Amino acid sequence: GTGPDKLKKVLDKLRLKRKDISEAAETVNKVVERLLRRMQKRESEFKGVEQLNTGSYYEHVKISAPNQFNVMFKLEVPRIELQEYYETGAFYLVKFKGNPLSHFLEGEVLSATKMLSKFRKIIKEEVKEIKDIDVSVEKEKPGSPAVTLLIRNPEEISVDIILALESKGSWPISTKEGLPIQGWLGTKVRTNLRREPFYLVPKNAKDGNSFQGETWRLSFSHTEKYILNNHGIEKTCCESSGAKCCRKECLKLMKYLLEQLKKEFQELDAFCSYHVKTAIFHMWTQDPQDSQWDPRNLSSCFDKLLAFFLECLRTEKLDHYFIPKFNLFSQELIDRKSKEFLSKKIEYERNNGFPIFDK
Ligand SMILES: Nc1ncnc2c1ncn2[C@@H]1O[C@H](COP(=O)(O)OP(=O)(O)OP(=O)(O)O)[C@@H](O)[C@H]1O
Numbered sequence: 001g002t003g004p005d006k007l008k009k010v011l012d013k014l015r016l017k018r019k020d021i022s023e024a025a026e027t028v029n030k031v032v033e034r035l036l037r038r039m040q041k042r043e044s045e046f047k048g049v050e051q052l053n054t055g056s057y058y059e060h061v062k063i064s065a066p067n068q069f070n071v072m073f074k075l076e077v078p079r080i081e082l083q084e085y086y087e088t089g090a091f092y093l094v095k096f097k098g099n100p101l102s103h104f105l106e107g108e109v110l111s112a113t114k115m116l117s118k119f120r121k122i123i124k125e126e127v128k129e130i131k132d133i134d135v136s137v138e139k140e141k142p143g144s145p146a147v148t149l150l151i152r153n154p155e156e157i158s159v160d161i162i163l164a165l166e167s168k169g170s171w172p173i174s175t176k177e178g179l180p181i182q183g184w185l186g187t188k189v190r191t192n193l194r195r196e197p198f199y200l201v202p203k204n205a206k207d208g209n210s211f212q213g214e215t216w217r218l219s220f221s222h223t224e225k226y227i228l229n230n231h232g233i234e235k236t237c238c239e240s241s242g243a244k245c246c247r248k249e250c251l252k253l254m255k256y257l258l259e260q261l262k263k264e265f266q267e268l269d270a271f272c273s274y275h276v277k278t279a280i281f282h283m284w285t286q287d288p289q290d291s292q293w294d295p296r297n298l299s300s301c302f303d304k305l306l307a308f309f310l311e312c313l314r315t316e317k318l319d320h321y322f323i324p325k326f327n328l329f330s331q332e333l334i335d336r337k338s339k340e341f342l343s344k345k346i347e348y349e350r351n352n353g354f355p356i357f358d359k
């Protein structure tokens with residue numbers, strides 16, 4: 001009946017949804033592994049592709065939609081020269097310092113359009129050879145770089161395949177002051193994480209253009225998975241020989257709150273789960289102690305995350321955790337109107353016992 005007990009009940013409800021999600025993921029993994037084997041056997045620019053096992057499913061925070069999965073295929077690309085397209089670090093053009101990708105160049109710039117067109121062509125050919133699972137490729141949607149598989153098991157599962165370039169060079173200068181984990185996971189962890197590769201994912205800017213179509217966004221999905229699964233100041237946080245915290249529980253509740261609100265109000269189309277993830281990264285930095293995230297504090301921790309998110313909405317400021325000058329809540333990206341509408345809705349739920357969770 002009480003507020004704290006109701007929030008625990010929501011987490012139970014989310015726990016129950018994970019069984020269908022896990023079962024669907026087994027089918028997705030079967031298909032993805034079959035497709036990757038075919039891609040690794042075929043001679044092409046994409047022969048070196050591998051699954052990057054990142055994203056909400058592998059972070060254990062996929063809370064809904066067992067019929068929709070996102071999968072990343074990484075391709076190592078040596079000697080990438082990056083050019084900032086936005087000096088905030090929001091977008092990059094890829095250039096090079098013979099080139100295996102030389103067929104995808106528009107002058108000196110790597111064409112995401114050309115490279116994705118061949119990627120899609122090959123995936124479509126190889127998926128047709130998968131004879132023992134019912135799987136097809138969804139017709140291409142303009143503005144959507146994903147190559148989407150449709151699996152029927154017998155129910156339909158959609159799998160968005162995202163091509164990600166992997167660079168082993170040092171991280172871009174736009175990330176210099178990002179990943180501010182020094183007081184939480186520490187300086188040794190930060191140094192080790194920044195020695196890992198980084199990824200580039202195709203994404204159109206839509207603006208004055210010229211090179212619209214050929215821009216890429218940075219991706220740190222591997223780092224984010226590491227942080228989600230190694231999220232405590234104590235190394236034993238949430239391990240068998242350690243103490244549970246409520247960090248991931250707060251993430252799941254806030255993701256669910258946003259997902260429920262977005263279902264009801266098309267005014268919220270501009271918001272996405274990555275805004276919640278980015279906000280909770282900042283909150284984990286602000287409140288680094290595991291004791292601040294004791295399971296008994298679930299309700300007060302969720303409330304302080306809501307308060308922090310409301311402050312980001314009010315100030316129209318939510319910095320990308322890895323790229324500090326990239327403001328995800330800029331007036332340019334999300335109307336002041338949309339932020340005020342979401343602030344009103346979150347405040348309502350907060351002061352009335354979260355009726356949208358009852359749905
Ligand atoms: N607007 C965005 N800006 C930057 N990265 C984004 C954005 N939207 C999604 N991502 C990327 O999505 C990755 C997470 O993949 P995932 O499969 O969890 O997709 P999702 O749509 O964010 O998740 P969910 O289905 O749980 O809501 C993150 O590593 C992040 O880099």
Ligand SMILES: [Zn+2]
Nearest residue numbers: 232237238245
């Ligand atoms: Zn923990």
